[PDB]
Design a protein around this nucleic acid. Structure first.
Lengths: 184, 293, 478, 193, 204, 204, 204
RNA sequence: ACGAGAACACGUAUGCCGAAGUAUAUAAAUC
């Protein structure tokens, strides 16, 4: 049982408006600064990945998806247990962005102002040694699709497309070699 | 010639020699004693009933049945275990009409009570003072079933028997036994005239059966025992209030015939003096009450 | 030697050649039993009475048929009494022992007859009386011999008292029918009342002993007064004594005198709580024999007159003397409750104190002696005292009563539900004789007095167990 | 010459134990198996109490008759029996007539305990009783009845039977009636409580 | 000759288990309610007050005690008889309390469930114990006899000591594990028979 | 002879679940409030103070244990005579807590919902546990018998050791998951019966 | 025999939903503030540290575990008695956190609105969930018994690994979507009962 | 003037001593 980690930053270009309030933006009431629910990224990557592969109308009625989504993302409501292997945590700002904005005296809400950076930290559990490569190439595909789609509510008018940068794939628990992987 | 019925409801102590003894019935002398003491106690005259009353022994009765003592008239093994014979069969007894199986059934049916040795103690000793051993003693008691009891026969004129009625009415609140002042031997009574009792009492024959304890006077004893079948039983005991020491006062011994005796020649009796070195006479009753068959 | 003794001695042992023939001793087991016995006894010097040899040699038919004896000689009367009574190496060991005892221990002089009697009893109480194939022999040899003696002595009393001297012609059926002899019974009343006059549980054996001893003393006295011996006593115990005597005037007068003395003494010692009754019915030689079932009749008649005597046991003079005044007020016996007798310091009268002392001594000492003065009262101003064994032989050197100890040769000593059917009937047919009631009484006495003690040696629940055991044993008995 | 009868009932307040047979076995009748109070028990307890209170009074009323002077008993005490009311009520409510109590004893120095049983007449039962008094002297009836009243008081505040120091025997007296049953002496004024 | 009466109320503090059946509690069988037997009280007072004064090994063997203790409870066995002076009767369930419990519907008896853990194996075994409810009351009565006039004050002092000791102790069993604590209240002294005044006397 | 009194308050730190009736708790039924039985306190203190001293496997077999343990808690079971020297009483829900809880509208009982996750199946099973509330208090009293004048100090040292050990452990059931932690406050020592000194004695 | 104490602070960085009252959050009834039940920590740690070692399917069916887990935690279910050696208590808000949230006028709970968008129909279904404000601090205590003088070092190495795995995970529910990430801080070791040397032990 | 009469089946001791309603189990999994 080894815990591999993924981390990275996300760049904001189109004034974002997620819609965590349900017109304000969801805020952690400790800093009064925007956040991103992890259900947001989880579900949106889930829907894109499900659409990419075959999606059956009967399975649409029963909320059933492909085996890849049921393994990586995991649902565990059909009577067959599927505990998720990709803990997504909520994303905060980067102190770099905060320092830059404070130096230039720019507000955060207009919508999520442009030029932000977000620190997303995923934890991946290795429940099986073999399927690691398949799972990570699938995650790479999902990341690409997300990079070429939209996140947020009501973004079909020009808002909610963002970029991925600056990853680091470090093993935090275990004795497994994790040098040959890649998530751009 | 009335008969008296008595029911007790409490155990009674009659006894023969010791307090450990328990006896069913008593004798005409014990009841003459009781009546004499009660008359002297009530303050009446003993003259009328000293020499006019004839009394019989006590006898058992059950629900609707009566018994009489065995007269001294082939199996010779079953009769010897019998003490009382029912009235209906009394005549049949004297004519040899009673069979062994009937007698055995009679022996079976004749349970009219039971016996009990009640144990007690005495602490009036130096137990009051200090360490002193207790003295367990024993009294003997007889207890009746709810419908058994005693009956008596008395005869004479109407006046004497009215006196006797009064005496029994007074007496039914004292007792007829031993430890009377300890809670034993009280009774309730009724006056009865049964037809068959009168029929037996009014027979006509040549012999005679004794229903009491009596002794012949001197001048007739030689002619009393011409042809007789009897039993002599010594009768002794202690007195009630003759002189100073109770122990120094004890009745002179007396011998008398029993209650199944058969006599060919009748005798009158007497009330006999059994006193000596006392202040006042002590009487024993001895006057026969016959049935002539 | 008085001729009575000659008959008696030739009578007890007249049937011993039968044992010397059963023993198989080749020396004296070739001929008829009478001559075998005569040859055996012709050795010992003490037993050399000539007329005794004559008596023992011919106790049967042919022997007298070819012996042409004199007119006065007891072989004829032996024959008659024998008839009326009649109605394997261990034997060899027994006859060795018999030879030793006869040549060493016993004496033959007068008064040795009781000792000879105990000797014969202690030796022969189990020898089979006869082995007849057509008869059931429920008797020992002791009973045949003893009852033969009793019958012989009674026949002699009868024949001699009437002044007949030609014994042969008179006795050699017609005589068998004559009212020759007599059955006599003693019954003492009040045993149950006197035995339960104690105030604890083991103390009620001493006065049982006293009653038994008085009965035996009075019966032995009676036999002494009549110049016979203890042969003539059939049964004793309970309260009874069944005895056999002769039918003559002299014995009748003496029986009447003895009765008067006993009545007087019993009244003197005790007021009325203990009596004694004697009744006698005459019997012929045919009655005791089984001829027409008359033995039952005889027994019933004796019981009847006994009941009658019980019904009228006093007279007018006695009853008036009884109701005569006497001193009272003094204390009564603490255990016996009778105030007519002077009392001692301890609080017990003479007799009850004597009984308690004699029980205390009996628990340790075991011989009783009948003397003129002593400890416990007896009839005719006699007393019983307690003594020990060696003391008993020294007293014998210069009558003794024991407890189930068959000591022989020590002077003169006397070793001490459906009952009616057994006592009156016995064996109704083919065995209805006095001998059968004799043996039945002996066996019952052995069961009651000796076997009961053996059973109780190992002894509410116990009472029930003993009752069940007794019932089962009696069921096995009959 | 008159005879007087004093009748009433006695009620059992705490369990009673006479136990002549023992000590559990309580005295009964051998046929009907119903508990009773023997009259010797009451006579002796009353004698002891009244003597402790104080003589010629105890001697005239209970009688001695061997001390060199002879005095005859003047009060007769009878046995007591179960009453009909109590039998009916107990039969309806389904209650037994007698209890069994379990007890224990402790060894000093060893602290080991061993058991006991004591059989004991039930609480609430009732008994009927009658006493007789023989009027031998007219000028003394008031004194004799004062003394008998004192005796009943003392026995009411005391115990009958055995084991009363540990809690058994307490009784009460109810429903008294005092009637002159022989003679013509006026006893409609007496009281016994 | 006088007799002095003492009456009062026993109150149950923690659960009580006289439990004389052997696990039931002792009951009257005409009413079916608990009672406090008097032999319990006498035995506990005997033990406590005896241990107060000197209790010796030789005095341990023979069940004899100090002279004062024998005087108040009786010896009457030593070849020197001693008659008792203090008679202890039973105590019964009070009517006030039965009224209260019937009104508020409170059951008269608790059934506490208990457990034991053995060593080496730690396997537990359970059990059930019945016990009287707290807040119950009982009514008690004592009688004391004046056999001698000059010992009354000392005897009542000793009875007061016994009361104090018992009120800081337990009745019944399981006393060290919690059960069985009592108090006495609402007492009263009266000379019920005789002519001995008892106004200065008191038992707390 | 002397008896000495200890008294104090038990303070409930986390939830307490004795469950003497068992998922309910153990309650009085004159007032219907929780209590702490004395049996559990005695047993837990005994187990701690026995384990702290030696515990042998043969001694584990039959509840044979150290000498001081049997002197202070009693065996009298192996033919050696030893009755307990410490009397432990029950703990009753205190009055000040009643007043505070009434006037702030805070109940006397929490109802905690618990879940179990199965192995290789991932199905949850629910349960309900009824815990006494935090912040409560109880009152306790101990009685010490002085059977020997030269062991009081040693026995009190052992007692304070047991109390300290229990202040670092749990009383009740299911304490390895956060239940039963307690504390002791306001301890007072008095000699109730005798003429013995208790000014130098202390228990922390 | 001795008992060591482990103490410190749990610092939550992301959402913490425990919901033990369940959609509210489990809460003390005397202060009206959230807690982490010790049951949750013990269960989560057991599952992590037990999955790391061998977890056989046959063992899963019979619910048997590895010997290390049972000695550190105790099962006593297979007939072999194993009492827990690690005792875990709950957690509560620290004083500094209370002061900080009071001075900054910041609440203790966040209401998150979540939208479910369903396949083939596109109907938005809303939901409200309560979470504990990120950045708060809880105080925790573990108690460690010593039953063998040797195995202390191995036990503490294992508890280190357990803390590590928990710190790379989530606590409570709603973890695979962004809630539960915490870490440990300010760990301290202090021997509180006994005479043991545990100054070289190190919990990070 | 009754084989009678005086006569508490009483007395000392209880309900005991030792014992934990305990041991395992995440109010959890999907947008």
């Amino acid at each position: 049982y080894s815990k591999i980690k993924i981390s990275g930053t996300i760049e904001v270009v189109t004034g974002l408006h997620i819609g965590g309030g349900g017109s304000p933006v969801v805020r952690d009431l400790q800093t009064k600064l925007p956040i991103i629910p992890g259900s947001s990224i989880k579900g949106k990557m889930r829907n894109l990945l499900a659409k990419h592969f075959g999606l059956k109308m009967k399975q649409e009625s029963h909320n059933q998806d492909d085996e890849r989504v049921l393994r990586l993302f995991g649902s565990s409501e059909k009577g067959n247990i599927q505990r998720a292997r990709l803990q997504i945590s909520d994303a905060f700002f980067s102190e770099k962005t905060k320092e830059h904005f404070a130096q230039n005296d720019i507000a955060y809400t207009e919508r999520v102002t442009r030029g932000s950076e977000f620190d997303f930290v995923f934890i991946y559990n290795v429940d099986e040694e073999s399927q690691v490569e398949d799972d990570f190439e699938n995650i790479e595909k999902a990341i690409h699709l997300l990079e070429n789609d939209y996140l947020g509510g009501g973004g079909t008018r020009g808002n909610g497309r963002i970029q991925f940068k600056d990853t680091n794939i470090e093993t935090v628990v275990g004795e497994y070699d994790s040098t040959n992987l890649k998530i751009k | 010639t009335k008969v008296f019925k008595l029911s007790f409801k409490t155990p009674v102590h009659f006894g023969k020699k010791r307090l450990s003894d328990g006896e069913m019935t008593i004798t005409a002398d014990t009841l003459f004693s009781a009546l004499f003491i009660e008359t002297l106690q009530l303050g009446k005259d003993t003259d009328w009933l000293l020499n006019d009353l004839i009394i019989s022994d006590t006898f058992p009765y059950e629900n609707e049945l009566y018994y009489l003592p065995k007269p001294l008239i082939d199996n010779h093994k079953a009769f010897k275990k019998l003490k009382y014979v029912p009235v209906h069969h009394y005549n049949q007894y004297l004519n040899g009409e009673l069979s062994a199986e009937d007698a055995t059934d009679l022996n079976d049916i004749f349970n009219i009570g039971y016996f009990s040795l009640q144990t007690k103690v005495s602490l009036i000793a130096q137990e009051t003072d200090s360490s002193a051993d207790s003295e367990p003693y024993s009294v003997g008691t007889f207890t009746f079933e709810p419908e058994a009891g005693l009956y008596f026969i008395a005869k004479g004129s109407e006046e004497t028997l009215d006196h006797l009625n009064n005496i029994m009415t007074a007496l039914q609140y004292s007792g007829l036994g031993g430890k009377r002042n300890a809670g034993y031997g009280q009774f309730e009574y009724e006056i009865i005239n049964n037809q068959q009792l009168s029929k037996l009492l009014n027979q006509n024959g040549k012999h005679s059966i004794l229903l009491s304890t009596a002794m012949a006077k001197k001048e007739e004893i030689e002619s009393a025992l011409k042809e007789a079948r009897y039993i002599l039983t010594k009768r002794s005991g202690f007195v009630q209030s003759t002189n100073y020491s109770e122990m120094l006062v004890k009745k002179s011994d007396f011998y008398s015939f029993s209650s199944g005796s058969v006599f060919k020649n009748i005798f009158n009796g007497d009330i006999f003096n059994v006193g000596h070195n006392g202040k006042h006479p002590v009487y024993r009753y001895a006057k026969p009450l016959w049935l002539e068959v | 030697m008085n001729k009575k003794n000659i008959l008696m001695y030739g009578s007890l042992l007249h049937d011993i050649g039968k044992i010397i023939y059963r023993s198989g001793d080749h020396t004296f087991s070739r001929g008829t039993h009478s001559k075998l016995g005569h040859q055996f006894l012709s050795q010992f010097s003490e037993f050399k009475d000539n007329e005794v040899l004559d008596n023992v040699a011919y106790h049967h038919y042919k022997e007298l048929a070819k012996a042409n004896l004199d007119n006065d000689n007891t072989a004829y009367i032996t024959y008659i009494a024998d008839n009326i009574a009649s109605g394997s190496g261990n034997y060899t060991t027994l006859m060795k022992d018999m030879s030793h005892d006869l040549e060493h221990k016993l004496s033959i002089k007068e008064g040795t007859f009781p000792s000879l009697l105990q000797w014969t009893e202690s030796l022969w109480q189990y020898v089979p009386s006869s082995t007849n194939k057509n008869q059931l022999i429920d008797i020992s040899l002791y009973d045949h011999s003893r009852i033969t003696c009793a019958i012989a002595s009674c026949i002699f009393d009868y024949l001699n008292e009437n002044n007949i001297h030609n014994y042969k012609d008179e006795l050699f059926k017609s005589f068998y029918q004559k009212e020759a002899f007599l059955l006599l019974s003693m019954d003492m009343s009040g045993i149950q009342d006197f035995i339960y006059n104690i105030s604890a549980l083991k103390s009620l054996r001493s006065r049982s002993f006293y009653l038994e001893l008085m009965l035996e003393v009075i019966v032995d006295q009676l036999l002494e007064r009549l110049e016979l011996a203890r042969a003539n006593l059939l049964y004793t115990g309970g309260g009874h004594a069944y005895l056999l005597v002769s039918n003559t005037d002299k014995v009748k007068k003496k029986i009447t005198q003895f009765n008067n003395e006993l009545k007087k003494w019993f009244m003197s010692e005790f007021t009325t709580d203990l009596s004694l009754s004697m009744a006698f019915e005459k019997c012929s030689g045919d009655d005791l024999m089984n001829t027409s079932g008359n033995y039952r009749t005889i027994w019933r008649n004796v019981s009847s007159k006994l009941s009658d005597i019980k019904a009228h046991k006093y007279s007018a003079e006695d009853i008036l003397k009884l109701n005569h005044f006497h001193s009272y007020g003094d204390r009564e016996c603490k255990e016996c409750l009778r105030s007519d007798i002077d009392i001692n310091d301890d609080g017990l009268c003479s007799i009850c104190e004597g009984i308690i002392n004699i029980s205390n001594d009996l628990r340790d000492k075991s011989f009783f002696v009948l003397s003129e003065t002593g400890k416990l009262k007896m009839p005719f101003n006699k007393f019983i005292s307690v003594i020990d064994y060696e003391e008993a032989e020294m007293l014998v050197q210069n009558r003794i009563y024991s407890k189930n100890k068959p000591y022989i040769g020590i002077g003169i000593s006397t070793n001490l539900d459906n009952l009616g059917a057994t006592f009156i009937s016995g064996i109704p047919e083919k065995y209805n004789s006095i001998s059968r009631t004799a043996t039945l009484s002996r066996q019952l006495s052995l069961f009651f007095k000796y076997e009961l003690n053996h059973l109780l040696e190992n002894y509410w629940d116990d009472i029930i167990e003993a009752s069940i055991y007794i019932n089962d044993k009696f069921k096995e008995f009959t």
